[PDB]
């Protein structure tokens, strides 16, 4: 007598890496970076009109 | 290990500069987070409690001693956990009493006497750092001076401690204020000693807890029982319902009014003693 | 160990840092296009007002 | 593999997860039914021939 | 590498004949639009399930 | 500084899987994440500079926390008796009389420990000081059992400790002691546990007493880098034991506790100070406080108040019983080994 | 390591069925009687027939007394070979934080502390059984302390019934209830005797300046909404007070030098604010979840910082 188990294929997946640029919603945004944000206190913008 | 408290914006001149002053003064936050926004601290959070609320607040909360104060974010140690990671905290008194060393020190709301931040629209009431033989005490003084006002004394206006005299008078508020402690301590004597007067006559049990008892309770509470029971007497009434009800409620004030310590001191190279406004050395792990 | 299995259980668990790093990474990716929505909706007042 | 996507305060931090099922076989059988006669087993058997 | 080729996927193309269906386009994707009961369970007794 | 032990060495100097852990971490790779698919000094001093500078190229052992505190040498003397001592603190001494005036129960006299404290500032220079361990146990002597040993702690104390007529003091502060009971101001509410003695530094009148408020005791830098050892030491008429008296000969974790026993009576007050070793949780202590001393009980409504004082983390802890010499005499002293400190607090059973 | 962690490690025996190992590995945060604190123990020293006296089987109300006589431990890994448990009394980890587990069917909320109970709960008594081994396994439950504060409550005072329902609870509007079950009265005059001498030694002769106010609080609960909903439906002192007008000694014992109410408030508290842990075990830990929420549900594990 003769008898056995097997294992067929496992499958995985991918996670998809999404950037964010890549989003048409990126319009909105204007991303401009500090390497240091934490030292700065309150920073400002001036608005003339 | 460390917390962080971040101010939010619009903070004026005189604000700022009353955070730089309570520097090392004991803040109680919710839950160990590193973003946790200052309404969680203020106290606005209690939500206005009296006195006994805070002595429940105070225990499902979490103490953390404030370490410097940087303009953006305010950080904090927590008590429990990150005074086992980092040695040893600086803290400040606000207590009357000056601290010795190797004193356990617990902390007490403010029942004496706030700073408050008026930019940010906001309060902050801190805890009172004085050791755990004055709290018990100091607790039990002003529990004892509101039963004297629900008909006081010639005395016990009065505490001495190192040498050094304390006014618990410094009134009409307090007493307003600390009033619903001194509804439970009378109601939960009050059910208690009619429990122990309704089941002591019920049984006197004969085996040896019968002649164990009245031996022992010989001119103890066998005369305070007749004592009682001469202005007193002796359906179904609910008598073993209620000593559920008494010791739930017993139980709940045991926590209350123990006061554990969070902390002790372990003072190196500096005095024994610390005296108020002065910073003391603070851990509380091995 | 002098074996193979252990050598084989640090490639499991090195590779499962991979499994993670990638999954959180892109985790600001996608973290800054939930921020976006929670910011511009909360600069956007409804149409019928 | 889930991904994720980092929130903010005060949302708990949420970490990478990871899903393993591993599906049982399930076996079945078909029949088919071919039956012959009598006289004609004896033809093919070279008998009556 | 937490992304390799699925083995699954190393496997020439089959041979391809040309085979008669309807393939209907629903929204964007194709599909075999097919009714059996004429090929398969003609002229028996079995029901059409 | 590699020797041939080479199996363990490496895990003595801070270890094998160190250096593999540090392989897939700093050794390998490229990832985070990757991509796809003159003769004597000057070279002594010079040498004294590399005595230093090898502790800053690097940087198991537990942590303490020292103690400093600079105290006067009037009841306690911390050059008579030597690193491995208990050391008790005190209150301050002026609250006495105004406490023993409320808590006293009527019929008793308030004005007994103004007096009686009166007078050991009176003998004493014949302020919260220190009160030493072995200082404590003469004073109690009067109401130890056996007294054999409890004459033999008061024989060191009247000729060695720092002070003229300590044995004076000794009549004084366990009046004091008496006077303690009596006025229901209790000595266990007074005394503070301070660490065990590694150091101390005197001068005129006072010293400067260093100990161990938590830790373990045998690895404290001692001072003295030629002996930096130090083990605890308490004199037999205080220490008692639990697991022999029961029968309890399994082994296991012990740990330390501070017992008191108070004995009211009119005029008949006794003070006692013992050091029990056991096995037992602190919630499970009181009955054996009813078992022992339940015969103080009777005649007694707090007759007990204890206090954690440390744990021994052996599975066998390990006692030793000899007779060290105070000065010219000697005590039956039993020896504790490995003790690492965590105090406590006390407790009332009225 | 050695101050910080204590690892104590049960040895798992050598015959046991791979069933009965998995088993043990679903025991992962699971609650541990020690006897003692060594390093080397074995199953059959933990498990229900250690725990058994002699010749009877203790029922639920003494299954607490001989929980207090013992280590409670916190399974840490279950190992192939052995099971490594930390004891809560000496001190929990390195950083302080211990994965425990919700078998009760209450969630906890931060800062709740953790007092753990035998299962008391009907259709709950669930024992792990290692056929393999011939071993039950009592694994107790963790609750929030004001429910093991009131579950101790009903079994005391079950159990002075018999010397002559209760058995219904509500939890943040969750009806449960508990199994009623027949009680030894060995352990239950134990219970008893608890009572009467930590209930008499909280009586003072303050305590008698206190009585004569109770007819200013059935005045007083008829104006505050809040003593309204103090005393109870179920009180005793206002049946107490309509058959009973007490008065007080007029003067007392040298009664201007000593305070008669403040002793008697200490006194109270020593014996009957005492009360709640002499009866059940301690809660010697509490939750503090980091990053996750404020409510750890059941079966799910929670972080556990030392909690006096």
Redesign the interface.
């Known amino acids: 007598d003769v008898e056995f188990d097997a294992l067929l294929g496992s499958y995985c997946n991918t996670l998809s890496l999404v950037r964010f640029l890549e989003l048409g919603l990126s319009v909105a945004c204007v991303c401009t970076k500090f390497p240091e944000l934490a030292y700065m206190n309150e920073g400002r913008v001036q608005f003339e009109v | 290990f460390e917390a962080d408290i971040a101010i939010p914006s619009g903070i004026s001149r005189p604000d700022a500069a009353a955070l730089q002053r309570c520097e090392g003064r004991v803040v109680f936050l919710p839950t160990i987070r590193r973003q946790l926004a200052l309404a969680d601290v203020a106290h606005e959070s209690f939500v206005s409690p009296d006195t006994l609320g805070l002595l429940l607040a105070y225990r499902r909360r979490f103490p953390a001693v404030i370490t410097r104060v940087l303009p953006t974010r305010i950080v904090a140690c927590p008590v429990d956990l990150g005074l086992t990671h980092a040695g040893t905290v600086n803290l400040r008194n606000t207590s009357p009493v000056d601290l010795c060393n190797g004193d356990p020190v617990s902390l007490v709301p403010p029942v004496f006497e706030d700073v408050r931040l008026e930019s940010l629209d906001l309060t902050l009431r801190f805890p009172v750092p004085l050791p755990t033989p004055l709290a018990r005490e100091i607790v039990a003084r002003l529990v004892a001076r509101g039963i004297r006002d629900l008909n006081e004394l010639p005395d016990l206006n009065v505490l001495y401690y190192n040498g050094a005299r304390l006014s618990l008078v410094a009134l009409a508020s307090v007493n307003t204020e600390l009033r619903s402690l001194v509804l439970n301590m009378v109601y939960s004597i009050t059910e208690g000693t009619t429990l122990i007067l309704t089941l002591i006559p019920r049984l006197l049990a004969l085996g040896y807890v019968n002649a164990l008892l009245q031996m022992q309770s010989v001119t103890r509470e066998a005369a305070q029982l007749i004592h009682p029971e001469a202005p007193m007497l002796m359906r179904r009434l609910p008598l073993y319902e209620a000593l559920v009800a008494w010791l739930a409620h017993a139980g709940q004030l045991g926590d209350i009014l123990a006061l554990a310590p969070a902390v002790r001191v372990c003072t190196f190279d500096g005095a024994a003693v610390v005296q108020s406004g002065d910073m003391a050395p603070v851990i509380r792990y091995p | 160990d002098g074996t193979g299995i252990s050598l084989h259980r ?1 490639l499991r668990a ?2 499962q ?20 929505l ?1 910011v ?1 909706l909360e600069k956007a007042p409804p149409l019928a007002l | 593999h889930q991904p994720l996507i980092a929130r903010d305060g005060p949302h708990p931090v949420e970490q990478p997860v990871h899903n393993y099922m591993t599906k049982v076989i399930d076996r079945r059988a078909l029949n088919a039914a071919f039956s012959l006669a009598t006289e004609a087993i004896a033809l093919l058997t070279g008998e009556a021939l | 590498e937490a992304n390799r080729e699925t083995l699954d996927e190393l496997e020439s193309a089959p041979q391809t004949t040309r085979v008669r269906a309807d393939l209907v386009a629903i929204g964007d994707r194709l599909v075999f639009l097919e009714a059996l009961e004429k090929r398969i369970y003609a002229a028996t007794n079995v029901p059409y399930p | 500084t590699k020797p041939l032990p080479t199996a363990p060495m490496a895990w003595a100097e801070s270890s094998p899987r160190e250096l593999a852990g540090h392989a897939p971490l700093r050794r390998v790779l490229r990832p985070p994440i990757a991509r796809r698919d003159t003769r004597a000094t000057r070279d002594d001093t010079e040498q004294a500079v590399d005595k230093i500078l090898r502790g800053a190229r690097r940087a198991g052992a537990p942590r303490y926390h020292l103690t400093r505190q600079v105290t006067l040498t009037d009841l306690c003397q911390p050059n008579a008796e030597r690193a491995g001592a208990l050391l008790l603190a005190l209150r301050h001494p002026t609250d006495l009389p105004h406490l023993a005036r409320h808590r006293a129960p009527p019929g008793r006299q308030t004005e007994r420990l103004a007096e009686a404290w009166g007078q050991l500032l009176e003998a004493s220079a014949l302020r919260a000081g220190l009160v030493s361990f072995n200082f404590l146990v003469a004073a109690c002597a009067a109401a130890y059992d056996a007294r054999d040993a409890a004459e033999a702690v008061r024989a060191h104390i009247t000729t060695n400790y720092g002070g003229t007529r300590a044995g004076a003091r000794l009549d004084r502060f366990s009046e004091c002691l008496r006077a303690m009971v009596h006025t229901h101001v209790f000595p266990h509410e007074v005394m503070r546990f301070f660490g065990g003695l590694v150091s101390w530094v005197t001068q005129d009148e006072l010293a400067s007493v260093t100990a161990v408020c938590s830790g373990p005791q045998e690895a404290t830098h001692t001072g003295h880098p030629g002996r930096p050892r130090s083990a605890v030491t308490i004199p037999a008429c205080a220490f008692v034991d639990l697991d022999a008296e029961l029968c309890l000969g399994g082994p296991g974790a012990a740990f330390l506790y501070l017992v008191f026993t108070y004995r009211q009576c009119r005029d008949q007050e006794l003070c006692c100070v013992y050091v029990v070793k056991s096995q037992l949780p602190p919630r499970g202590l009181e009955a054996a406080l009813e078992r022992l001393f339940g015969r103080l009980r009777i005649t007694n409504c707090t007759y007990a108040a204890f206090a954690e004082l440390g744990v021994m983390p052996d599975d066998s802890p390990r006692c030793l019983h000899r007779t060290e010499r105070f000065g010219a005499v000697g005590v039956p002293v039993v020896i504790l080994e490995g003790v690492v400190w965590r105090p406590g607090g006390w407790r009332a059973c009225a």
């Open positions: 640090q090195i590779q840092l991979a499994r993670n790093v990638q999954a959180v990474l892109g985790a600001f990716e996608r973290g800054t296009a939930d921020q976006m929670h511009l």
